[model samples]
Target chain A: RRNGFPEVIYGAGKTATQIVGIVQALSQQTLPILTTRLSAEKFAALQPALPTAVYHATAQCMTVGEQPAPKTPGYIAVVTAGTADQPVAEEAAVTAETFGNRVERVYDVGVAGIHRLFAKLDVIRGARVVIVIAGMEGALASVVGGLVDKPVIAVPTSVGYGTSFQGMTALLTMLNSCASGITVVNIDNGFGAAYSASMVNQM
Target chain B: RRNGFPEVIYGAGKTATQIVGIVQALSQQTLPILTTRLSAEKFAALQPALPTAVYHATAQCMTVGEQPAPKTPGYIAVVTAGTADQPVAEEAAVTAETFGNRVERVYDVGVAGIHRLFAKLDVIRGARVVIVIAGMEGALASVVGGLVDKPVIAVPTSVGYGTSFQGMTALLTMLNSCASGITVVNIDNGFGAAYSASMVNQM
Candidate 1:
């Protein structure tokens, strides 16, 4: 376990049976388990046996076990540039909250209309760590980085056409940001971002 | 050209004839060209006509036309965590140098021996932008990020056993860095990191 978090199973490549088997083993010990990238079919297959398990459809994630005490002092802010970016943001929000970090969400406040973001600046800045979710230029991270002193974790989604190149443009934009205190994760990797944010907020 | 740079051809999927045809068209404009992920066989096939082009075997990259004058105020520092990361480091170093950014390299100075990185702190911190190339946990980016005020772009190489998961662990480690001001690109995406770093260095 890294930072008191249990080993997570990336569910996209595994079969439902495999997921169930792993979960069953971990559940016996009451170890909190996180399964990311779970398909709808896989969730349905596992739901019957693990009756208390909860599923987050947008993030494609599933969790089992009782909620732990909040481990972090300040809350983590999960901010999104657009509605399409919610799935990735949800993955981050759910992961952070499940792992004992307080989480707040600010969704669909993208750079296309900068005013929308400034409106929520107070709440976002209040968080200990901010996770910015964006695609199609991904300029939101830089804008947020300039405003807040806390750490910013940028997640680029594969949500654009042609020049987007499967989130490459947004990924590059975030990586090249002039604003200080900004870090980036893989395209559509919300879980990784949240894990790190939790670490910082806990500190 | 995107952002005043010549179009870069991702060579993995293109045929030799396809690459040659594209270069032939761009050559008329005397445009500087870059081809990434090119095989030695493909480079050999293209060398006959593009006589002045240079091939970097370890980087799997090719360059054509005269390099532009240095466009950035300060150089870009390309630092590697280990010998295994050299290939990706070479890709970033060559790409940054090819596109009008002066580059300095500090090879095989990873975190296992933290002193090696500290020894070169002056040179790395002096750069306008630093590209940290690493694998196997990718702790180097955070360490560098903490020391320097400049942007640190991380490139995680697929060079580890078992749990590394084709550089996923390193990628996650970088994404979740405790240090602020650090950013990351895709696994082994040295070209992407250099392109973004060149943008920042030029700015």
Candidate 2:
């Protein structure tokens, strides 16, 4: 997997002590590692002995050791429907980038008005694969799917109101899309989508 | 809610005898009731004294007593991506109909072939609100949402294999759609989607 390098470490639902032990073990191998969805508190707790680990604040992720350069420049487009969706989108971007895939971010071009998305179509369409992120109705995937022929990996965020059903609404909308050549991952599963996209990019 | 009638009975994860006892209690009160996700064996076991109950085999649902007429005719459209998706779609249809919302059914018009969906556009767009039920890529919701100005309720099913991830794939795809005025419910959550749609129709 990715040349036998340690690929990922899911940070949510686990204690800081557990993470410290895992990170320590991975560090001994001198391999690049990514830990996603880590809270600030968890990062701080792991900071003492692992001072080399870098925390990506906004993305809620961390990187340790050397990250290989992308095999292809702009290989993946990490697109988001809104500013609020950036966290999840960033997780995808970081994961892809660490996996040696060049990631291009096209953020905040959601479909509420449509024209904003049109403005960034050139950059979005240029990538080998696209990862669309959104919350609240989650219509971004379909719109992006319609425009690009490349594989679209859609990620649903736990954003929006009561009826959005904690991102369930967006999840359903994307799953039942009319567009072909599109696939989906779990709610806020930025890492998973990017992992799949990175694999596709290599192919 | 709905003239003080008993609205739902979630049939999954419950023993047949438990369901029988509960149905008996409700029947004594003369309240119209619906039980969803019922297996054939469970229905057979409960059929002895509850002879008046009607079972929708495809949907795995059962109805006791008369269903109320909708406040508006054909106000809800229950559309499916494929025949395999019928169970979830039927659950929505039965739930909406039971809630006094007139329902129109359009089955097996998935997005794999765009023309199939286009053929039924007139009826689908005519409804007060639409419920798009699907699995796999779950693209139908975005297509319908794009065509109609009304609200679209998407329900993802645990259909498809491999990348489908037990409906997670479809769920994420729907949640990240590019269409507007769309909301979603849980995987195979036909009843929840219909309940929300019925509320919207009544409004």
Candidate 3:
């Protein structure tokens, strides 16, 4: 409702044709658009028409137009539990960046082996907000939530399945987290987590 | 440490040597076991070891040894909004049946088109418990809860993702449902719904 509206596009269900149409419309309005879960196959089709489009293939996301500048003083630590969790962590990182915030990625710091997270504790504690991303029954969120003094935003990714039920076990695990100041977003909702973290960091 | 112990195995994650070993040991004790989210690949392996193993492939589940019989008179109505929801729906159906409770499937009755549910009001009303499954921002639970006097167990499934957040939207949607006596389970937890519904039907 305010100046320079930011719109998000979902790339999975929608086709490249449909995506380009929406992005084209937004470009005319000159708004910043962040499209999530975009596939490489779609990127091929989209990059042609929208030459300015920048695709983050690893995170499966696409960005159009200039990102908001002058990042806030504080930083967001985008932490991940497993190698598979990098995709979602990237989403948080990219979104936070676009919203005018800085982020530091703390990847491969799962609770299964907490030594890495302990070693890199400063990176997390130093951040204004912590985005902990994990998938399989996310115990990492609880661990990270306990350690960090900053507001902890847990993003449960759907890395794989085995009645992990596309990350439900992890979702509930994060929801019933042991630590205080821990907020849970929808499963695999990196964008939501980043959006909230941006506002928190801004203040 | 218990009598007639129930063992549940996840099909998707575990396809290695140990599941077969666990199944063999459980079989030695003649204990009834239910494996949730079981794949056909695993089924082929289990069948060779335990010939009695029965697979409900549609539900993506399998059974080992004999199920506890003498079904209860009152039935569990397994209801779903969309065709994609049958896997979870079938999970509830098979699970209810296994636990000595009859089941009535009322599929393809989503709130997007509520007429189908209205047309089959008798089946739902006749049941002791109802299991409502949906993925995309599920609203069927509320409608069914209002229509039927029975307890409604809402299961949010991971059908397809579009910031549907792997059924998280529907999970919260069902959790904050308007109807009374509507209980929400873990997302896509058809087994959980069936277990609770089975108990209710038995009483």
Candidate 4:
């Protein structure tokens, strides 16, 4: 009870009018507010009602509390496989921010180029938790797990080809992971991964 | 490897042509073939070619196994919160059957009427393991957890109203459950729950 915000609302599938209503309802509690999964149209619609809310279009998210750069904080660093996973990776980053922690993003560094992922080893190793987002075989999580000593939150994205099995194959791969200290959330469960990351990294 | 085939395929996100190809691929491995999540259209389309395949439209699952009741006939009972959950519950039941286990179900008995679920203790007690399918607050898992000493696979369905958080609320409720001897699979993960139950009940 001694903090800025209590929680954030996921604004997907809600009308802008509904989003404004939910935000207003939460504001009554006097908590810092945040919303995610906003579209360009919804973003435009929300601007009038939520004049104070800052929109991060790249991340497709909104926040009302303090917004600042990560500043190399010792926290969760989200790693995305490719540009296709930006939305989910952004969700994780935004959630971590909402929880009042620094979140660094390492995007477009998939296993296809092992060298690129390894190049950011210092930042990846510095974090308390790592959220690895990927599609295709979803092998990035295991790669992160193998590299880091911290807990790995493997988020499988629905951003792959048909045989990827709507992210089920990746989900199974993460669930049946050979690597230790690795856990998994559902397909497209970036918010969950971030929430879990916040819980662990908060300590 | 002593008897009839096993390893069911969940046919979700696959076309009728795809399902037939998958079944054919599995059959050659001498694996007893089964598929779930087939639409009526796909099922009808596949019927002529795969004459041995049996489709349960209500269950939305298909099976192609020798007509022999399993040798290692340990029971796995699936309990659901309401009729909305029957489809997923049936997925568990049918999948378990394909694995050569005796599968039973009790439906529409959620925590809103604890007495309804409690009254089925006779059937509930008969199973080696129980799979509880629920949504909303996902309270049935906790209730079933309290009632049973055996391991309960609490399956949180993606069913509920607003702020049910699209099964997130249910998921958290299950994860944070104080009830002893209960584990969880992902939301709407009937196949995973049934697979784990099959493995556990068989052991």
Residue lDDT tens for model 1, B1-203:
35767668999999888998998888876558889999999988888878888999999999888676877669999999987798889989888887888999998788878899989999999999999999876899989999999899999999864246679999999999999999999999999999999889887
Model 4: pairs clashing at backbone N, Cα or C within 3 Å = B5-B32
Better of 2 and 3 by TM-score: 3
Order by lDDT, highest first? 1, 2, 3, 4
lDDT of 4 by residue, A26-144 (tens): 77656567777788789898798878888877678888756444433577889988777888898889878877778888988888778899899899999999999988767888888
Error of 2 at A83 (Å): 1.2
Worst 10 residues of 1 chain B by lDDT: B157-166
Kindly report the fnat of each predicted structure, to 2 decimals: 0.00, 0.00, 0.00, 0.00
DockQ of each: 0.02, 0.02, 0.04, 0.02
Put down candidate 3 lDDT per residue, B1-203, tens digits, no spaces: 65333677776788736678778777655557788888777677677777777899899888776665646678889989987798899998988777767789999998766788889899999999999999886899988888888899999998765358668888998999888989989988899899888777776
Off by over 4 Å in 3: A3-5, A161-165, B1-135, B139-159, B162-203
Q: Candidate 2's residue-wise lDDT over B21-128, tens digit each?
A: 887787765557899989998899888868889999988999988765656665899999998898889989988888888889999898788898889999998999
- Candidate 4 CAPRI grade: incorrect
How far in Å is the alpha carbon of A35 misplaced in model 2? Answer: 0.9
Q: Per-residue lDDT of B1-203 in model 4, one digit per residue for the tens? A: 45343756657666788778878777765767778778888888899989987887767888885636674767998999988888778888888887878887888888888789878988997889999988876888888888888889988777779897667677778887789888988777787788899888876
Cα-based lDDT at residue A196, candidate 2: 89
Q: DockQ for candidate 3, please give it.
A: 0.04
Give Cα-based local distance difference scores for all models: 0.88, 0.85, 0.84, 0.81
Judging by lDDT, tell me the better candidate of 1 and 2. 1
- At residue B50, what lDDT does model 4 achieve? 92
